Design a protein around this nucleic acid. Sequence first.
RNA 1: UGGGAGAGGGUGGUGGAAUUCCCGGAGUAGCGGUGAAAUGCGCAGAUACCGGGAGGAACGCCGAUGGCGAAGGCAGCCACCUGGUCCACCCGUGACGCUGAGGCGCGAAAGCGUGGGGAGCAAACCGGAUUAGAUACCCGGGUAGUCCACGCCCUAAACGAUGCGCGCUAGGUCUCUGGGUCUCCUGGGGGCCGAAGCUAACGCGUUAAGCGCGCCGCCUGGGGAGUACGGCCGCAAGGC
Lengths: 88, 100, 275, 68, 114
Amino acid sequence: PITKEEKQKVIQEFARFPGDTGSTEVQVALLTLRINRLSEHLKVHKKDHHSHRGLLMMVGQRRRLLRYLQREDPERYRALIEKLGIRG
Amino acid sequence: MRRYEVNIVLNPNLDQSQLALEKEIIQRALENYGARVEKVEELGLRRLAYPIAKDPQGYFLWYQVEMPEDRVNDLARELRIRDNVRRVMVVKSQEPFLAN
Amino acid sequence: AVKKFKPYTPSRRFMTVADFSEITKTEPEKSLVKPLKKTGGRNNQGRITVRFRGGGHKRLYRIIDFKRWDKVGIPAKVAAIEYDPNRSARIALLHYVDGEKRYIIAPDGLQVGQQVVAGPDAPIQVGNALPLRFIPVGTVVHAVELEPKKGAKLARAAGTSAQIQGREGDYVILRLPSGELRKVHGECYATVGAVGNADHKNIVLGKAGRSRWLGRRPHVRGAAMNPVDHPHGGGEGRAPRGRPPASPWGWQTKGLKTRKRRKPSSRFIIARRKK
Amino acid sequence: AKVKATLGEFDLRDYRNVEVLKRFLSETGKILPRRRTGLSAKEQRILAKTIKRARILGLLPFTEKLVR
Amino acid sequence: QVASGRAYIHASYNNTIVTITDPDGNPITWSSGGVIGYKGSRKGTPYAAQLAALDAAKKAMAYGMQSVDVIVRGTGAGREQAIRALQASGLQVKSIVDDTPVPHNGCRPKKKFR
RNA sequence: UGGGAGAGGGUGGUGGAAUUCCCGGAGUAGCGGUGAAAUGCGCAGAUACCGGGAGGAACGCCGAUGGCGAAGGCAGCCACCUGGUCCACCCGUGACGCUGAGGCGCGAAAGCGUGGGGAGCAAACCGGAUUAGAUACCCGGGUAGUCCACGCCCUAAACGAUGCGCGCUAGGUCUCUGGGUCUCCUGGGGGCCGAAGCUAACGCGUUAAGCGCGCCGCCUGGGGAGUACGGCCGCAAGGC
Ligand SMILES: [Mg+2]
Ligand SMILES: [Mg+2]
Ligand SMILES: [Mg+2]
Ligand SMILES: [Mg+2]
Ligand SMILES: [Mg+2]
Ligand SMILES: [Mg+2]
Ligand SMILES: [Mg+2]
Ligand SMILES: [Mg+2]
Ligand SMILES: [Mg+2]
Ligand SMILES: [Mg+2]
Ligand SMILES: [Mg+2]
Ligand SMILES: [Mg+2]
Ligand SMILES: [Mg+2]
Ligand SMILES: [Mg+2]
Ligand SMILES: [Mg+2]
Ligand SMILES: [Mg+2]
Ligand SMILES: [Mg+2]
Ligand SMILES: [Mg+2]
Ligand SMILES: [Mg+2]
Ligand SMILES: [Mg+2]
Ligand SMILES: [Mg+2]
Ligand SMILES: [Mg+2]
Ligand SMILES: [Mg+2]
Ligand SMILES: [Mg+2]
Ligand SMILES: [Mg+2]
Ligand SMILES: [Mg+2]
Ligand SMILES: [Mg+2]
Ligand SMILES: [Mg+2]
Ligand SMILES: [Mg+2]
Ligand SMILES: [Mg+2]
Ligand SMILES: [Mg+2]
Ligand SMILES: [Mg+2]
Ligand SMILES: [Mg+2]
Ligand SMILES: [Mg+2]
Ligand SMILES: [Mg+2]
Ligand SMILES: [Mg+2]
Ligand SMILES: [Mg+2]
Ligand SMILES: [Mg+2]
Ligand SMILES: [Mg+2]
Ligand SMILES: [Mg+2]
Ligand SMILES: [Mg+2]
Ligand SMILES: [Mg+2]
Ligand SMILES: [Mg+2]
Ligand SMILES: [Mg+2]
Ligand SMILES: [Mg+2]
Ligand SMILES: [Mg+2]
Ligand SMILES: [Mg+2]
Ligand SMILES: [Mg+2]
Ligand SMILES: [Mg+2]
Ligand SMILES: [Mg+2]
Ligand SMILES: [Mg+2]
Ligand SMILES: [Mg+2]
Ligand SMILES: [Mg+2]
Ligand SMILES: [Mg+2]
Ligand SMILES: [Mg+2]
Ligand SMILES: [Mg+2]
Ligand SMILES: [Mg+2]
Ligand SMILES: [Mg+2]
Ligand SMILES: [Mg+2]
Ligand SMILES: [Mg+2]
Ligand SMILES: [Mg+2]
Ligand SMILES: [Mg+2]
Ligand SMILES: [Mg+2]
Ligand SMILES: [Mg+2]
Ligand SMILES: [Mg+2]
Ligand SMILES: [Mg+2]
Ligand SMILES: [Mg+2]
Ligand SMILES: [Mg+2]
Ligand SMILES: [Mg+2]
Ligand SMILES: [Mg+2]
Ligand SMILES: [Mg+2]
Ligand SMILES: [Mg+2]
Ligand SMILES: [Mg+2]
Ligand SMILES: [Mg+2]
Ligand SMILES: [Mg+2]
Ligand SMILES: [Mg+2]
Ligand SMILES: [Mg+2]
Ligand SMILES: [Mg+2]
């Protein structure tokens, strides 16, 4: 799984200010982390459809946040997806 | 790293040098698969509820350990390869659940 | 995975070729090849004794080490895996630390860079050779000697394997690739694993020409011949067989068992093949 | 005559404790119903799981003939 | 000839067979509803099991049989009656253990059993 | 951020019961099967009993008016990988929300392709019965298939015959799983019985079929017909 440590580093790396958890950026980046692992997991467990749904739900969730953040502050979005290498 | 309790049942009609020897292959492997031993409990002979390998008794080891999660499976395999090892069961370690 | 083709000629529509994925070195070891003397199916009298052979691609024989007990305890590195035209299996190049090089037939899962060894003490892992008596019952095994020090004779074809079923005295009991149950002596060497290139059987030759490249010349039906030639020969128009179906030499060919009756190895065969 | 009562504090997750565990088996060897063990739902599930592990180890039987 | 042995009662809805073995497990004699003289469904009755257990035990006693362990398999009608008869036979009956085979959900049963 | 329960999903291992077949032993006149029989099996030694072995498939007790999942569905045990979900803290974001024509994915069983595997079961099929007849029901056999991998099919009484989300309108009792000041209270789930109210009635009733808003899908007499034609999908069967 993801370790508290790995989560923190990400929580910390993306936070807008020291105590920040749950801002848009932190939210998107955490998802990106769970996304890229499941994605990897499914690459090997191609018949794990049940987890694939979750993936979709997350992919969905990250999308809405990105749509929000893009509406609210273009620069922040452009930077975020660029920080995480996201669009396609 | 996570904690598991390796259980092992060995051939009961061994002499103590073979048994020491099997224990050796075992402890080398625990080491080789990056398992760090904590407790250890060797209740030796003990009567089985049913015959294993056509034999009413079994020689019992046990070892609370801390090892890489990815290596527990390969270890259980290597622990089984010996013709004198008759069971392995590596269980995730967990807190007691008390009644009364 | 076998490789398909788009149907851009009538023949490519069904032709499939092997993927050669495991192959890492495309030239044989110069000191391990010798010319194969092509026979055409002719014996030393010059007579065709096996019909319909001739005309295939030229081939160099790769010398294979079917003994292995030859170098007990000396380990080797798997240097490469190569194509061998003389067999269905691929072959693995071994660099012994000794510095001797040999070929073995390449087991499923052999990795180039890995190390193999032979002898009574060899780890029970893919690529190693041990006498059968030191191999755990249940293990699948290939290139098996049929009698001690006589060389690997069993389970050499692409994809094949034998499984150890039990032990009895000086002998172990194997399930052969045919499903025959047979006793083989404990001192006989076998190599752990199955033979690789297991997709071999899914190849579709695709055209007449490809059988031709394999040195397999066209085969003609007794039914298309005349009575001088064959039991099924002649008759006006097409004909059914008109007698029990027979070989060119007259023996019956649908069911007639042919194994010699009083043969000494009958004693060691436990159960004739399945299906 | 509920079993849970006729015992002091014990570990429900302890699969090597054959002396406790073997009391929850019918004389035929079967895992006993909740109505005879006096266990709750949550605990009875932990019981059955550790009895099953135990039978795997050789400590507990999978079945026993019925004597009369 | 042997003094103590075993008595197996195979009791199915169509029949009762009783075979008497030695201590090691090998049969000395056997009987059934068929041997005692019935055909058809009558073989399955309690009176069938009775003659079968008697005639089985009786033949055994003539080989010097005296004590038996009783093993029971099946849930047939003439089961419990078969046991009566072994007791009443002139044989000791040290024990009566039921070792009817039951799967831990194995092979799919025939249709009539679903 | 702390925790929780669970047959949720995928992979790899792995345990005992039973059935079948083979080998060894011991034993003999029947076994089996039905409403009753017969076919069948059996002196070329069956059944029943003991020991050995082989192989596939399903996991008894626990087990529940239980649990998990969006549904299809999911059950021996172990480890790894992984989804959903609930609770407590009231720490962070600042309406970032609901639904959703198209599209995309998943989708019991049967079925299909390529390759495995095949103990039990069993369409087709043979035979015995039953019967006026018996292409059935019952009995003896039996091949696909049922099992695994990979790719297809895309249906269903795929049902709660009940689309999703939100808010509002008495309670009683049983239960699963949390957190409490643990008598008792407070969440989330599963049943029952009911206030108001609904409703053609039957029944529904904080798990609404009540009172309301949002969005979607669907109906408009029976048959002909889920047929024809066309189009799109499919290897075909066939699907929309
Ligand atoms: Mg979510
Ligand atoms: Mg976007
Ligand atoms: Mg072993
Ligand atoms: Mg092609
Ligand atoms: Mg091409
Ligand atoms: Mg192509
Ligand atoms: Mg063309
Ligand atoms: Mg063509
Ligand atoms: Mg290759
Ligand atoms: Mg390949
Ligand atoms: Mg060349
Ligand atoms: Mg030269
Ligand atoms: Mg030279
Ligand atoms: Mg030559
Ligand atoms: Mg010459
Ligand atoms: Mg000459
Ligand atoms: Mg001449
Ligand atoms: Mg010829
Ligand atoms: Mg020729
Ligand atoms: Mg080759
Ligand atoms: Mg090839
Ligand atoms: Mg072909
Ligand atoms: Mg050639
Ligand atoms: Mg040919
Ligand atoms: Mg021809
Ligand atoms: Mg012709
Ligand atoms: Mg002609
Ligand atoms: Mg001539
Ligand atoms: Mg002639
Ligand atoms: Mg002729
Ligand atoms: Mg002719
Ligand atoms: Mg003719
Ligand atoms: Mg002709
Ligand atoms: Mg003519
Ligand atoms: Mg003609
Ligand atoms: Mg002609
Ligand atoms: Mg003719
Ligand atoms: Mg003909
Ligand atoms: Mg003729
Ligand atoms: Mg020979
Ligand atoms: Mg009968
Ligand atoms: Mg026999
Ligand atoms: Mg005779
Ligand atoms: Mg037996
Ligand atoms: Mg706050
Ligand atoms: Mg939606
Ligand atoms: Mg849609
Ligand atoms: Mg489907
Ligand atoms: Mg299916
Ligand atoms: Mg099917
Ligand atoms: Mg198929
Ligand atoms: Mg008929
Ligand atoms: Mg008739
Ligand atoms: Mg019929
Ligand atoms: Mg039938
Ligand atoms: Mg049948
Ligand atoms: Mg069969
Ligand atoms: Mg077919
Ligand atoms: Mg068909
Ligand atoms: Mg329903
Ligand atoms: Mg529902
Ligand atoms: Mg409908
Ligand atoms: Mg909708
Ligand atoms: Mg509506
Ligand atoms: Mg509560
Ligand atoms: Mg509490
Ligand atoms: Mg639910
Ligand atoms: Mg409730
Ligand atoms: Mg329920
Ligand atoms: Mg009600
Ligand atoms: Mg009212
Ligand atoms: Mg209520
Ligand atoms: Mg209404
Ligand atoms: Mg109409
Ligand atoms: Mg249609
Ligand atoms: Mg239809
Ligand atoms: Mg049409
Ligand atoms: Mg429809």
